[PDB]
Amino acid sequence: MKSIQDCEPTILEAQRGVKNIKKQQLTEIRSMVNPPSGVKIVMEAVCAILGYQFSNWRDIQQFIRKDDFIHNIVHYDTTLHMKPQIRKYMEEEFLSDPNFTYETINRASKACGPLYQWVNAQINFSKCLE
């Protein structure tokens, strides 16, 4: 057969994950001086996924404010799963917290959930050779 199997329809799911997002949701987010903690943990999760070194809110504003924030997202690898250790890191760090919890975030702003869904995909595909 022509399948990869291991996480297979996760990578057709992860594909919805990139096609969801809308720029205006980012533009408001990047303006947010101090959004709730529910935003904050999600953004630490994106920063790890893109593999910036770990952060905290002050630093995160300075980072996210960049021109290429949205661009890097739109330029990214949906097919990345090539040996990040960001999987075992992100799991020790976040997939063990039930406040990293889809819903809380899912209401959080407009479409913050789709971003959580995107991260979740980048983790749940990263289960790729499990």
Binding site: E28, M32, V33, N34, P35, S37, A108, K110
Partner: protein, 412 residues
């Protein structure tokens, strides 16, 4: 016995500032003797700053004018969480040096405003922190609540739908004025065309002296702060009077013979002389407190009320058959020079709990909808550690207080 007072917000301090004057005139305090017994809280200096300077420098011990110095927001969130958080403590401390400066008070007259800098959000966290530290006491807030048209901001609607849930569950009985509805009164019944935020404040400073102040002068058939919480509520929910005062007229519609007791009471039910655009015509009343003061003799009243009791435009609600109270005090209202009411001899503050305020709740719930319906102005709040929750749940909540204030009508 006597009773601390907290004004929070641009507004609330102004309200104080008039109102606290009248008091002091009232007992014959100079601008110095004993020392006022209340506090002014705000996140943006300039208002309080006048107060530190304009006559009445003295007459507060300067501990109690706490002023922030950072922003004022103008948007709840920030004022509740984020900025305001810093100040809380420091305020909370004064009233706890101030509680224990005195024995057996009954509650906190808050005056806080439903638009203004601080002071939906902030108040939100204040009445809440009092409610846990002083779970028992009485919490009367006179809040100022935004007109059906004459709004002056583009987030009046956001602030006020956020506030309800904080005041619903935590303030005992919340009085409402509105700026717009006050305007008529100044124009027609008083006859000025300059009604500044400064004139109306001189007014509310009169309706308040008649609840409390005056009761403390002890007269003939006295009413008291617990009493309310029995007589005006009638269920659990924090229920909301509307206030009305009676003989408002100016110093040369004065001469038109006495204001009879009989008249002034009749003049309250008139839906062009209340204070909150609402009009009681199809409201059912449910509870009144008529507090009279000055030469009003029990009998007079107890006749004039009978007439009303039969006027039949005006409906009491079925499942109560009674419903009155009477305050008679002595002390004939006192008249602030830089104000505009006549030397009356007696006036009558009926406040009362009506299903009419179904009205007022509507408009704002409506306004709000439009804006939320796009999402519109959200980002100033989201970004302050306040949530998408708070929007949805403070509407859905307040709708479901609004069916109660209708249902408790009419169904017997």
């Amino acid at each position: 016995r006597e009773c601390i007072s907290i004004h929070v917000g641009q507004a609330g301090v102004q309200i104080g500032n008039a109102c606290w004057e009248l008091y002091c005139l009232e007992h014959g305090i100079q601008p110095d003797g004993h020392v006022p017994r209340a506090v002014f809280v705000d996140l943006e200096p300039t208002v309080i700053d006048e107060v530190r300077t304009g006559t009445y420098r003295q007459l507060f011990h300067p501990e109690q004018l706490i002023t922030g110095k950072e922003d004022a927001a103008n948007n709840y969130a920030r004022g509740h969480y984020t900025i305001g958080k810093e100040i809380i403590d420091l305020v909370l401390d004064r009233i706890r040096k101030l509680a224990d400066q005195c024995t057996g008070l009954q509650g906190f007259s808050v005056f806080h405003s439903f638009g203004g800098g601080t002071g939906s959000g902030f108040t939100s966290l204040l009445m809440e922190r009092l409610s846990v530290d002083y779970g028992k006491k009485s919490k009367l807030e006179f809040s100022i609540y935004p007109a059906p048209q004459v709004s002056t901001a583009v987030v009046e609607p956001y602030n006020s739908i956020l506030t309800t849930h904080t005041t619903l569950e935590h303030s005992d009985c919340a009085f409402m004025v509105d700026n717009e509805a006050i305007y008529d009164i100044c124009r027609r019944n008083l006859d000025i065309e300059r009604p500044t935020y400064t004139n109306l404040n001189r007014l509310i400073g009169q309706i308040v002296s008649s609840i409390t102040a005056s009761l403390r002068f002890d007269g003939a058939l006295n009413v008291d702060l617990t009493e309310f919480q029995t007589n005006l509520v009638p269920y659990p929910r924090g229920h909301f009077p509307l206030a009305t005062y009676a003989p408002v007229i100016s110093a040369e519609k004065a001469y038109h013979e006495q204001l009879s007791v009989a008249e002034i009471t009749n003049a309250c039910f008139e839906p062009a002389n209340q204070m909150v655009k609402c009009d009681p015509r199809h409201g059912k009343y449910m509870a009144c407190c008529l507090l009279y003061r000055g030469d009003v003799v029990p009998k007079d009243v107890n006749a004039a009320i009978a007439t009303i009791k039969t006027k039949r435009t005006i409906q009491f609600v079925d499942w109560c058959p009674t419903g009155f109270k009477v305050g008679i005090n002595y002390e004939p209202p006192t008249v602030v020079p830089g104000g505009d009411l006549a030397k009356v001899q007696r006036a009558v503050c009926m406040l009362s709990n009506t299903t009419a305020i179904a009205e007022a709740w509507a408009r704002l719930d409506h306004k709000f909808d439009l804006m939320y319906a796009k999402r519109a102005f959200v980002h100033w709040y989201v970004g302050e550690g306040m949530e998408e929750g708070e929007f949805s749940e403070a509407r859905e909540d307040m709708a479901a207080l609004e069916k109660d204030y209708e249902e408790v009508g009419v169904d017997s």
